[PDB]
Amino acid sequence: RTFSYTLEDHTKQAFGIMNELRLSQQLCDVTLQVKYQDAPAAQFMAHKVVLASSSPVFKAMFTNGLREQGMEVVSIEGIHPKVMERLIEFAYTASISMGEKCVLHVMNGAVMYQIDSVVRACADFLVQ
Amino acid sequence: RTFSYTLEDHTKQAFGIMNELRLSQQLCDVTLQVKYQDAPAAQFMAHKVVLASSSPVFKAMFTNGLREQGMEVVSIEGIHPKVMERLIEFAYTASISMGEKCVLHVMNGAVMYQIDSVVRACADFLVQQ
Ligand SMILES: CCOC(=O)CCC(=O)O
Numbered sequence: 001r002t003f004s005y006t007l008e009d010h011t012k013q014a015f016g017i018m019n020e021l022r023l024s025q026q027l028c029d030v031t032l033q034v035k036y037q038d039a040p041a042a043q044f045m046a047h048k049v050v051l052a053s054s055s056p057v058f059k060a061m062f063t064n065g066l067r068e069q070g071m072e073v074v075s076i077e078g079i080h081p082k083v084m085e086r087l088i089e090f091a092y093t094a095s096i097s098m099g100e101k102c103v104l105h106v107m108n109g110a111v112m113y114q115i116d117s118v119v120r121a122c123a124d125f126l127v128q
Numbered sequence: 129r130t131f132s133y134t135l136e137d138h139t140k141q142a143f144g145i146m147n148e149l150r151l152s153q154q155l156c157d158v159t160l161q162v163k164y165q166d167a168p169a170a171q172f173m174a175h176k177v178v179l180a181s182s183s184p185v186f187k188a189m190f191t192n193g194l195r196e197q198g199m200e201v202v203s204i205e206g207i208h209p210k211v212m213e214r215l216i217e218f219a220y221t222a223s224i225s226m227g228e229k230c231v232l233h234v235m236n237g238a239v240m241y242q243i244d245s246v247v248r249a250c251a252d253f254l255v256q257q
Pocket residue numbers: 080082083086097098099101102105106
């Protein structure tokens with residue numbers, strides 16, 4: 001015979017533990033340093049493979065050229081720290097929540113990293 | 129006003145991409161050397177984050193002390209490569225499949241790494257016969 005099993009919500013469970021390690025700042029290999037004009041400088045630790053799984057730009061960024069081993073600090077301009085936070089939070093939880101006055105900004109940052117999922121979601125809200 | 133959104137199958141999508149990165153050996157930070165008895169040696173590269181998310185044992189051994197961040201080679205003992213390769217494939221696909229005269233072996237390695245999900249499924253197959 002042959003025996004097969006599939007834990008249905010495993011990915012949801014496994015991703016929740018991935019977010020835990022991200023808040024616990026454990027097993028991280030990248031540090032996003034965001035700098036926007038007239039904005040406090042931010043700093044976001046994350047896992048390269050997790051961001052690469054949610055954005056083709058993060059994936060192409062971390063798999064091309066000479067990459068730092070252990071911990072790679074990546075400088076980032078053109079996106080506000082608050083927007084870079086919601087993007088990471090979506091990648092780690094598959095959920096994104098902002099105010100009415102920031103959907104356009106989040107949508108723009110979503111396009112900058114080709115997170116197509118929250119691009120279309122921001123579109124449905126703006127033109128409701 | 130507020131806006132909320134939830135990609136329900138996102139976690140399945142991102143895990144599929146993470147399985148590709150494993151099969152392409154890109155961004156991997158651990159290499160598991162599995163030599164069981166006299167079986168032919170085998171190596172499995174993976175991401176410590178993914179393994180820590182599916183196994184509390186892998187999480188404990190990757191998030192304690194000072195690990196040489198870069199590419200850690202870890203020797204695995206007491207488990208057969210065919211079973212190990214399947215536990216890794218479960219961690220990246222959430223699906224496991226093996227033979228009948230075999231459920232005992234992957235249940236042991238699953239118990240060895242505290243993957244309760246597939247431990248109960250194997251136990252519920254031995255009882256049901
Ligand atoms: C330019 C900063 O404005 C924002 O986009 C704030 C982001 C947010 O509150 O979700």
